[model samples]
Target: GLWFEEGAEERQVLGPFREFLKAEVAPGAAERDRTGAFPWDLVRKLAEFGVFGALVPEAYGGAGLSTRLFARMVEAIAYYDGALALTVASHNSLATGHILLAGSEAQKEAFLPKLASGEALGAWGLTEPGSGSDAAALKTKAEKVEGGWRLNGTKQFITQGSVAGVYVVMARTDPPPSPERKHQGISAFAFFRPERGLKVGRKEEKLGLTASDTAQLILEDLFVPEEALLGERGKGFYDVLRVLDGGRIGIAAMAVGLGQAALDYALAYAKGREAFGRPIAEFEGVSFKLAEAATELEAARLLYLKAAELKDAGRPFTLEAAQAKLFASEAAVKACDEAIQILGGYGYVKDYPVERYWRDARLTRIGEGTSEILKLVIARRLLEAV
Candidate 1:
């Protein structure tokens, strides 16, 4: 059991789910990762559990749960399967977030219920081939036309690129007034016009999180009417930063989950695997390793909770979220790396899951925001506060 609980309702929602998630790893994850195929069954399973809608309002067919519960649920799932966690969080936090935060009432009525009910999956696009961490430098164009906006250029490293039903894409629709304001000319679109132009380009073969599809999205002159625009005309970048602050919390949850899993694996192995005529848990080296992982894992958990609590209280949490993402991701990577070391030869092979967890752990440091980018975010916030 975990050291502490979130609450009655939150605990109840997560209690049964933790085991349900951990059970999926052995039978469900391996084949999907082997073939690089999307886990359709697992997706359906999560839908049946009403996981996708856990953060939305009940009126729109969602649970409308608090942000803390949602973060806990994501963490529980990430403990078992990293790819599934990434897929769910990316869809919910980014794509669904755009609609939930920026959409009109009519737009919400049109989309939330479908997405909340899991009848439709979602994708969000922002990163271009040329722009990774520098999101304001994106060059995808959405020129105003006679009746609508026409989109061109591409989005790279998009999660659920080919599989999702709806995509919330950001494109530049106007030139900035001055050279210093390139970030202000952008606009958000709930692009549903899937007729011909929006094609899935090359699938990104990744270092980890293999079961989740990552690919290039080719927006070749795709058109959407004015109804598709999300939020204000030139505030797309600001909206995105807001979205990312929450997204960082989710990523931190995922990273903490991975670290917890690694610690559990290491603990179990050390307690059972005999060395020097006894279990390695008796040795100082192994005991010390497990102790260190547990300490770091607990710190990561608190970091995650601090940010989630801030968001739940409706307080500004950008810096805390960035710190959480930065620290927790790096901690998970170190834990997984040490987990493999503890497991020795078995950890190096696919026979044990330490290898998989290690790969997934490495990814958390890079995705959402690179550790380097997060440092920049944290520094800027500190300077502003000062």
Candidate 2:
């Protein structure tokens, strides 16, 4: 309630989106979280609700929306289901982003419609076992062959790795980057099925977001056509950085949603809970915690909004995005934890959604770029200007 309400169109779209999630995602969120099962039916129908194509251009059969609208939808979903939001965010920002930014017209034409129509789900491969924050150190090798590229390596921590119908994979066609140029030598490539030698490997057993399909992608001598390569070779690293900057806003927005959900749970509990012949919410101790959570959520929303605004204006937003993610994710962790505290013994139990909110909020700090890594990015960008 502390934050400014979203635009009428955005809010109107969320009405149907929330109704769909309540029917589809909310009922089964716990079960899916419990079993780590990917909800194929819900994931498949995302496009019908306009979420799947929120960011892709209309020319490609997408909504052609801005980051602002995209963030709100993701936030609304994350309020009820972090895993669901993660699934959508990864597909749209990571995989679809590469296509929109780097894919040739022919490539976009062939791929974007499938993703937009929900005929295809997308994944991105950048982090490998050997390389995460040091992404250019990835060992996913792509050797130039006569006809196309021979890619042989694996991707770690890939969301929708096993389930995606499309992928934007990063591999080194040249040697690893120089220390001075630790962001070079990598190239981005696209792949879809019927391509041989790429298989989904291990599925990650995560602490939270258990419903998301995070898994390993093993590419052993995988063959991709020459056209699969996106943009010029060696520009993949830059493209990835750009992609992550945008993805950070998505993550941050999701954090806001999770926090809001937690606060909503806590506030409701506090108002109804009675101790010492009065509502717990009447006590400053309990009420102040709710206030802080509400204020933090509002602050977090503004940060992500500013980042999105800068991005839509064609201005530099890397710093703003990183700052937003860093602050919002940490805020989610704290706010969720506070929600648990506000619930006391009830919060630790699974019967209440506050506990699930706490568990789900934990991932926001680590994904899209870890909070620690983001701090360094923020510091580097700040000092570079000075």
Candidate 3:
């Protein structure tokens, strides 16, 4: 019963995003990846299309669309380019969601309009050098100051760190109430104005998604006014976890897109490239691989959509999100790898986009949450005594 609802409206939105990607993002994808350049131009173009505010309320200058529609948009863009998808989704689901879910009326009014208008960019900062998966262990500290909090310490592997105009940062706000629950003491804050001591430190050289900047954020006595605190103190980790749950759906959608693209490329190549006086697709060996890839991609799409539906319906979808993200990401890795094999040497070369898909697909397993971590989350949900 779970199927993507298609209509003129959905098609209209998707068409332009796809065209923008094909005409603009895809053409420059390789160059950006090679040079490790940020695609600010493409980002601005996406903003012009209202992607930055796709999920925000119409009153806030957004399209006020459903989460399902938002996921589909992400999938469409991701099929052509994953880095752009990651950046956009991070801004929408992670950074922007923080304000929508927790910010005060004044806070939302102050930040959402600019974010929705694409006049400003946003980033999420939770992971630190020592805290990757264990975000509660964040070392970044926010000591109460004259009129606000003075933040210190560093956050690492932050997406859109270098170019974002606003950052949602998680920091330790209170000494552990009990030594046993350190994460309970952390708080979330929305920080801007890098001159206040927030500076880009080191940019990570990654295995893929090179167009998006992943860097270290060093906060040396960064001053965040009292109003800058997002939500209540000591709720930062919980807020971040909620944001990441929604983010998993976006990442899962992206994985489905990447996997589908890989399958399409491989099948197309097989049908065209001749071997033994016939199209390689005629061979059972190649045909079977294509069948598996296509099947996995379809299944991944279904799983992601199912998770999105639960999220839209206001249901408990943590397990579904974890399952969707885990299965879809792994499926992307498998599908892209098979695509390379089907294309033979051409797959390994940069002349075709398969190599890029391969590299980009690889990151799905690691981003949002690793395959191993997702499994752990799922297992706990399954085994926990209700």
Candidate 4:
């Protein structure tokens, strides 16, 4: 709970945002998750309230706040609905991040306004049918055309892919460079309409976060103008690497929120549910489990916030992000499991949200980066210090 002294403005903004989510958004979350319906109405309401503009610079019609605030806002959203949280996190950290790091001045001026205003929804096209964690070896190719590039590839498991208005796609520009520079051959582009060859292939049937749409993107002769290039001609892979590092923090925060929700539910149940002529909370077995969940949730929250602080200060946070994501995701899974046990048979019923929360928590371990991958990143970083 170490609050940053310089983040007062961000904290002020977050207070109002959290209140809005609790009042306007939380009420509908359970129904949305149960029915697998995207919360378009809620999104519209958030746009009306300028939630989308929180990160875009004020000059570009956005609040232009720090990443710390973004992380906190995401946590609040996830606390209510993990699906919406993940969708927004992808939009901000992955789709919008491409422009923040790589777009030309003209591109930024043209795109950021709509993105910040919620007039346009965005998605990232990086993972392919075969690519996943080995993203550097992606086979999606873009060939130079008369005035632009012709893209041909299929991207799978894309968040917001079914409904996004714009897509930041990564493609192979040149053959993999010599073995020494394999990662330098990739490039990034902004594709406006998949109709120009972009197509939604299929939607995944998932166990959780059903309210958020995830699908495959099909590109066949999709032509993007030269001006749509993101960053340099051959550094897209590195750009994405950096983008994912920041994304990990958002995922970690989501995990924290989900775990907290579970903890709250379990605590309330234990206090009210009577057993053996006494409330369950009076039993040490139940009370101690709640205590452990509370402790772990606090630790996860601190880790995520610390990573956000490093990012706000413009310091290297690669390891911090990885550590937060790894620990928080695992902790969430544990908390969800314990919460289910506390609720006994009621937790297994769809009537309660705990079952859904457990499913959503599972995604945090697999998305952005896996626990195994994060350990590798952490290990590499640790070994390099010697």
Ten residues in a row with the worst lDDT in model 4? 1-10
RMSD of each candidate relative to the true structure: 1.7, 1.8, 1.6, 1.8
Candidate 2: count of backbone clashes, pairs at least 3 residues apart or interchain:
0
lDDT of 4 by residue, 1-386 (tens): 34833266766777788889999888888888878888888888877655666667888777686777788788888888999999888887888878877888888888777877777777898899887877787888999999989988999889889888778999989887486677878999985655568889767889889888798988898888888888898889999999998899999989998999999999999999999999998999888889998998889988998998898899999999999999999999899888998998999997888888898888999998899999999999999997
Let me know the TM-score candidate 3 reaches against the reference structure: 0.96
In TM-score terms, candidate 1 sits at 0.96
lDDT, candidate 2, 1-386, per-residue tens? 22356777767887888788788778888888899888888877777766788888899989888888899889989988989999888888999988988899999999999888777889899999988888878888889998899899989999888888998899888774467785788899987864578888867888899999888989988888898899789879899999999999999999999899999888889989999999999989888888887888889999999999899889999999999999999998899999999899999888888888878889899888899999999999989999
Local distance difference test scores for all models? 0.85, 0.88, 0.85, 0.86
Weakest 10 consecutive residues of candidate 3 by summed lDDT: 1-10
Q: List the residue pairs that clash in candidate 4.
A: 194-198
lDDT of 3 by residue, 127-196 (tens): 8889787778888999999999898999888888888887889989888888669879888898664676
Q: Model 1, 1-386: lDDT tens per residue?
A: 44355677777778777767767654666556567778877787787667887777888788787777788888888888889989888888898877888898888888888788767888889999899898988999888887888899899989878888878998988888887788898999995638888999877888888999888999887888888898899889899999999989999989988888888999999989998799988998888888888898788888888898899899999999999989999988899998999998999988788888888778889888999999999999989889
Top candidate on lDDT is: 2
Q: Number of clashing residue pairs in every model? A: 0, 0, 0, 1
Model 4 TM-score on a 0 to 1 scale: 0.96
